[PDB]
């Protein structure tokens, strides 16, 4: 829970700082202050690591080409005035405007579509950095996006301490050191600036640990299909 | 006037929050140095360094 993690950023790690109140609890007055850090070691974490992969189903209209990925524009978001809404979100998928990286498309009967391919003129090209360019929609058709996803992000005026951050036990070190060195980083001091160093120099040694142990089965390999594609 | 005398509690109680005179000294450098500390701007191995 978030209150954990206050409470460990408070004593042991930043002790020897102002926003870490010597230990007794991060202040209710800096917490806009360590969540906008926490939001970007999330973000970090969730696209150098696989932690989160989700789908998203972008339903085809006749007079849309391109498709963006943005709440505004989701089935559950009932706030929203778009006249369409081709995000096909449920209660359990919710499509929180967490897109990392848009990795792999299908259809509705679940073949692979190419993602970016220019020979290939049935491919779905992405044009901006959220959204997605079908030139050939079909009233009658529908995505299946599948994207690496992020943690439903924290809002900065967010005061309730039960809001869970969903991170493995072996990488709430990784968010700490992250979050210590960018604390640390933001004065010029050369002291100061130097202890951000190490810090950022721990994260990235966490980081390299968790990629040499692979703790979110991530670099593994895969069965070899070449000997059967080129006919052997 | 009556004038009193000048006895060890009237420089140090002993105490950090004292009410001598070096106790209210220190007491006034150490908020100071808490204004400035509350602005992120000395980390707190240089606020017991100074």
Same mark, same amino acid.
């Given at each position: 829970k978030l209150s954990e993690l206050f409470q460990m950023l408070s004593v042991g790690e930043l002790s020897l700082i102002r926003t870490g109140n010597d230990g007794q609890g991060i202040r209710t007055q800096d917490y806009p202050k360590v969540i906008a850090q926490l939001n970007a070691g999330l973000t970090n974490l969730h696209a150098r690591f696989p932690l989160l992969e989700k789908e998203?189903?972008?339903?085809?209209?006749e007079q849309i080409s391109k498709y963006y990925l943005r709440s505004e524009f989701a089935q559950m978001n009932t706030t929203s005035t778009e006249k369409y809404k081709y995000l096909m979100d449920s209660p359990t998928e919710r499509f929180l405007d967490d897109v990392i990286r848009?990795?792999?498309?299908?259809?509705?009967?679940?073949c692979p579509?190419?993602?970016n391919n220019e020979p290939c003129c049935g491919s779905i090209v992405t044009?901006?950095?959220?959204?997605?360019?079908?030139?050939?929609?079909?009233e009658t058709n529908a995505l299946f996006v599948t994207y690496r996803a992020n943690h439903p992000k924290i809002a900065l005026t967010t005061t309730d301490l039960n809001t869970e951050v969903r991170i493995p036990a072996s990488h709430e070190k990784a968010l700490t050191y992250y979050i210590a060195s960018q604390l640390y980083s933001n004065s010029p001091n050369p002291e100061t600036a130097a202890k951000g160093v190490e810090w950022s120099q721990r994260f990235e040694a966490e980081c390299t640990k968790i990629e040499n142990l692979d703790l979110?089965?991530?670099?593994?390999?895969?069965?070899?299909?070449?000997?059967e594609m080129r006919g052997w | 006037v009556v004038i009193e005398p000048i006895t060890n509690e009237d420089l140090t109680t002993k105490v950090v929050d004292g009410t001598g005179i070096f106790d209210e000294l220190m007491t006034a450098a150490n &908020?100071?140095?808490?204004?400035?500390?509350?602005?992120?701007?000395?980390?707190?191995?240089?606020? &017991?360094?100074?």
């Amino acid at each position: 829970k978030l209150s954990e993690l206050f409470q460990m950023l408070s004593v042991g790690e930043l002790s020897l700082i102002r926003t870490g109140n010597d230990g007794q609890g991060i202040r209710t007055q800096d917490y806009p202050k360590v969540i906008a850090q926490l939001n970007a070691g999330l973000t970090n974490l969730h696209a150098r690591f696989p932690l989160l992969e989700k789908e998203v189903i972008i339903q085809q209209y006749e007079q849309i080409s391109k498709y963006y990925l943005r709440s505004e524009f989701a089935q559950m978001n009932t706030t929203s005035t778009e006249k369409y809404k081709y995000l096909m979100d449920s209660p359990t998928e919710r499509f929180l405007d967490d897109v990392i990286r848009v990795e792999r498309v299908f259809d509705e009967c679940g073949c692979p579509l190419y993602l970016n391919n220019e020979p290939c003129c049935g491919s779905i090209v992405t044009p901006s950095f959220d959204c997605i360019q079908i030139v050939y929609p079909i009233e009658t058709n529908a995505l299946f996006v599948t994207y690496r996803a992020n943690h439903p992000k924290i809002a900065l005026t967010t005061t309730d301490l039960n809001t869970e951050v969903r991170i493995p036990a072996s990488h709430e070190k990784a968010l700490t050191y992250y979050i210590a060195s960018q604390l640390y980083s933001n004065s010029p001091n050369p002291e100061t600036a130097a202890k951000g160093v190490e810090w950022s120099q721990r994260f990235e040694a966490e980081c390299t640990k968790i990629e040499n142990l692979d703790l979110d089965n991530a670099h593994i390999a895969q069965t070899n299909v070449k000997p059967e594609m080129r006919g052997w | 006037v009556v004038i009193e005398p000048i006895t060890n509690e009237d420089l140090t109680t002993k105490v950090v929050d004292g009410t001598g005179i070096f106790d209210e000294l220190m007491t006034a450098a150490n &908020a100071h140095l808490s204004a400035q500390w509350d602005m992120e701007r000395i980390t707190g191995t240089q606020y &017991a360094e100074v």
